[PDB]
Amino acid sequence: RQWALEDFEIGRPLGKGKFGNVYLAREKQSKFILALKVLFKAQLEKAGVEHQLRREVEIQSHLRHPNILRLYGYFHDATRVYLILEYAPLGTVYRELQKLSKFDEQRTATYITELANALSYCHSKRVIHRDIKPENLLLGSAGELKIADFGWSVHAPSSRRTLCGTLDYLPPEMIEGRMHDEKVDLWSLGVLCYEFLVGKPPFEANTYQETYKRISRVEFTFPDFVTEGARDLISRLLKHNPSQRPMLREVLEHPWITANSSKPS
Ligand SMILES: Nc1ncnc2c1ncn2[C@@H]1O[C@H](CO)[C@@H](O)[C@H]1O
């Protein structure tokens, strides 16, 4: 229940983040393989994330889902923060997107279904992720999608804010500073589905200021190859009005999703 660094053997780095680095690790006692994410307190303090970390650790620990990355434990070096995480052999969706350039409809539909299932579970338990991007999505050995990086996640409805980072996956309401609900995740689902098929985010721009306008205006276009079934789901998800956005169940039962999805709703 209480861990120390000595209990682990550290391997190659899985990932780097401004706050920290993620390492492959093996628990000595069990030979269990897992990902160890290392954060210095000092980097952490300057930003007011110390409370943010507490929210991430608590929510992820008590959540159990096939499509949600598992947090096994946490401990603190003097002074470093260590997170013990499930290890995903197939890596990030973001990496997969770079290699394939774009995802086929069958693969896209499956990720959405898995995402939707995980989100339904999250929403049921009163959790909203609020930050869903391919960099935050991991792949299981079976190749199943697993959601991760719950830091920005919070209980809703809530007012938690845009200043620090890229706006590509943020809803108009969050960027505009209006209070937001679970619908924020539905918007994210719409952005991801578009990015998977097109290979780029719908509101992507050279400029932060320009992206802000695109999101607020909600002006996006479809390449010719995107199917009408795909367009319909995307258009429904990307709605300036959160109330107009469909429920997760609606997404799961959508004809395009049902037809092209390997995994059942
Ligand atoms: N368990 C893990 N397996 C593989 N990569 C991971 C894991 N946890 C975090 N990462 C990587 O480290 C980054 C920081 O969380 C992620 O965006 C991802 O690239």
Contact 209, 238 (CB under 8 A): no
Burial of 94 (0-12, 13-18, 19+ CB in 10 A): middle
Q: 10 Å Cβ neighbour count for 230?
A: 22
Question: Does 4 appear as a known binding residue?
Answer: no
Residue of 185, 195, 91, 99 lying closest to 138 (CA atoms): 91
Breaks in the chain (C to N over 2.5 Å), named by the residue before each, are: 161
DSSP summary character for residue 6: G
Contact 59, 131 (CB under 8 A): no
What stretch(es) of the chain map to CATH 3.30.200.20? 1-91
Question: Does 7 appear as a known binding residue?
Answer: no
Joined tokens for residue 18: 């401004």
Residue 135: CB within 6 Å of ligand 1? yes
As assigned by CATH, the class of the 1-91 domain is alpha beta
Technique used? X-ray
Coil, strand or helix at 91? strand
- 220 to each of 34, 95, 196, 199, how far by Cα in Å? 40, 24, 15, 14
Contact 254, 242 (CB under 8 A): no
Q: Please list, in sequence order, all residues whose beta carbon lies within 8 angstroms of the beta carbon of residue 240, skipping any fewer than 6 positions away.
A: 172, 218
As assigned by CATH, the class of the 92-260 domain is mainly alpha
Residue of 265, 258, 264 lying closest to 105 (CA atoms): 258
20-27 β-sheet, strand order: 8-16, 20-27, 33-40, 80-85, 71-77
Rg of the chain on CA atoms, in Å: 19
Quick check: bond before 79 cis, omega within 30?
Answer: yes
Pocket test for ligand 1, best of 138, 139, 144, 149 (most atoms within 8 A of CB): 138
Pocket test for ligand 1, best of 8, 12, 19, 22 (most atoms within 8 A of CB): 22
Q: Which residues are catalytic?
A: 131
Place of tokens 């470093």: 80
Q: Which atom of ligand 1 is nearest to the CA of 91?
A: 4
Question: Does 136 appear as a known binding residue?
Answer: yes
Q: 10 Å Cβ neighbour count for 158?
A: 12
What stretch(es) of the chain map to CATH 1.10.510.10? 92-260
Longest CA–CA separation in the chain, Å = 55
